[PDB]
Amino acid sequence: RLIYTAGGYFRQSLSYLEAYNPSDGTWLRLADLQVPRSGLAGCVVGGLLYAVGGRNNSPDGNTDSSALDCYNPMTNQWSPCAPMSVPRNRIGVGVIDGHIYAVGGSHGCIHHNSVERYEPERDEWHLVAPMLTRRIGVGVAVLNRLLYAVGGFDGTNRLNSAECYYPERNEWRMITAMNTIRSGAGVCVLHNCIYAAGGYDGQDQLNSVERYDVATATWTFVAPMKHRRSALGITVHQGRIYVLGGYDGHTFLDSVECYDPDTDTWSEVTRMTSGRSGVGVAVT
């Protein structure tokens, strides 16, 4: 299983698809995206990688993306899928029962609270219940078959608030807010807990990482990342969190740090082939 990273931004939105293998520490250069994009999210359903939303920030202009594109690792080929109801830049994404949930993001000045679900078997999007809070740069995590939306930006303020979606009931509920305000953090699930890593608090890029425990309903801090970052990629591979690139306030990072929950330590495991922010990431 590899860590796939799609798109991102350095001077302009990028078309890269690359895969890191933690076994031998090597990088694979795979087929480019058909359209360049940053602020996208990545996910896996049935062994196929999906690139969702984002925006093509190029020299000619800015085009927000409603596009869903599917990459098959066996064929090294990208294929277009049905587009979302609206463009979603700085989107959040999660998977439940092989269905892709597109959460939040922006289209111009519009900051979405709306959410929609994709069915791969039918190639159809449908709108579900909208979030209680409008969120761009939102972190998404699936835990106990519930879709969590964590942090982000509502149009006016950056958020420490988080909320939880109930697919069977089709409704959202606000949960315990985070210790820190985090827009553009990395949010993932490891060992029955939601991790929120880095992001931007309104003033500074964060290196701090905090962990939601469901039973206690409390966010507690864990060991911080060596390098502060926002608009970072995030994923989990064999019981370790990987964070990929991002923006530190001054430069674009190629750094990849890995978190070991047993030792509560971060270490830099590799570098991306080039520094970038706003990548989509997934594992398969």
Side-chain angles (χ1 to χ4, degrees):
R1 307 188 81 199
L2 308 178
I3 298 181
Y4 292 77
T5 179
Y9 181 96
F10 181 71
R11 296 176 193 145
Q12 61 189 49
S13 299
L14 305 170
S15 305
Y16 295 129
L17 178 63
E18 295 171 301
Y20 178 69
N21 186 354
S23 298
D24 56 23
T26 60
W27 280 93
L28 291 64
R29 184 72 199 272
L30 308 184
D32 289 4
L33 291 158
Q34 284 174 40
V35 185
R37 61 215 295 186
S38 53
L40 73 162
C43 67
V44 178
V45 178
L48 300 177
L49 178 66
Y50 288 83
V52 198
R55 165 184 83 167
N56 186 7
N57 187 336
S58 81
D60 294 34
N62 292 345
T63 315
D64 291 315
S65 180
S66 57
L68 178 63
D69 302 81
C70 179
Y71 173 83
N72 185 350
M74 302 298 87
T75 67
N76 197 39
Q77 186 170 246
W78 284 95
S79 303
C81 300
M84 293 175 296
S85 68
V86 290
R88 295 177 185 275
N89 178 43
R90 308 196 62 199
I91 197 172
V93 163
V95 174
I96 310 178
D97 286 334
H99 306 129
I100 306 173
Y101 286 85
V103 181
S106 67
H107 174 220
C109 313
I110 298 161
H111 300 73
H112 300 304
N113 60 14
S114 66
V115 183
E116 48 192 306
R117 191 177 92 264
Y118 181 72
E119 300 184 337
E121 292 174 40
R122 299 198 72 181
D123 189 27
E124 280 175 29
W125 287 93
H126 300 307
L127 288 159
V128 304
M131 294 181 295
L132 300 174
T133 317
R134 295 173 183 285
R135 298 176 189 271
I136 79 171
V138 65
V140 177
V142 173
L143 177 56
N144 298 307
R145 302 171 58 79
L146 303 176
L147 187 73
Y148 288 82
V150 177
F153 180 68
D154 66 12
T156 67
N157 297 311
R158 293 163 181 81
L159 311 175
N160 72 316
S161 73
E163 53 185 298
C164 178
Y165 179 66
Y166 293 85
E168 299 295 308
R169 296 175 174 78
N170 189 36
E171 58 189 46
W172 290 85
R173 193 183 59 75
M174 210 73 61
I175 70 165
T176 315
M178 292 181 291
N179 295 310
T180 313
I181 297 179
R182 295 181 193 277
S183 188
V187 174
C188 67
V189 184
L190 175 57
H191 298 153
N192 207 56
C193 298
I194 305 175
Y195 286 71
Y200 187 73
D201 66 9
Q203 279 287 302
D204 291 311
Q205 276 71 18
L206 301 162
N207 67 6
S208 69
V209 182
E210 58 186 305
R211 181 173 67 186
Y212 184 72
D213 186 59
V214 178
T216 67
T218 61
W219 293 89
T220 64
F221 289 101
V222 299
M225 298 177 295
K226 188 162 183 182
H227 310 297
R228 66 188 64 259
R229 53 179 92 209
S230 56
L232 54 141
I234 202 172
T235 203
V236 183
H237 178 278
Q238 292 179 26
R240 301 189 208 285
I241 304 173
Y242 290 76
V243 298
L244 290 78
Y247 183 65
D248 72 2
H250 307 124
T251 68
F252 295 85
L253 313 193
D254 59 2
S255 168
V256 179
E257 300 184 61
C258 177
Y259 179 70
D260 177 23
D262 295 10
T263 59
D264 189 37
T265 63
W266 290 89
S267 58
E268 202 181 80
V269 291
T270 183
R271 291 191 172 85
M272 300 184 71
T273 59
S274 58
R276 65 194 81 157
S277 72
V279 303
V281 188
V283 170
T284 190

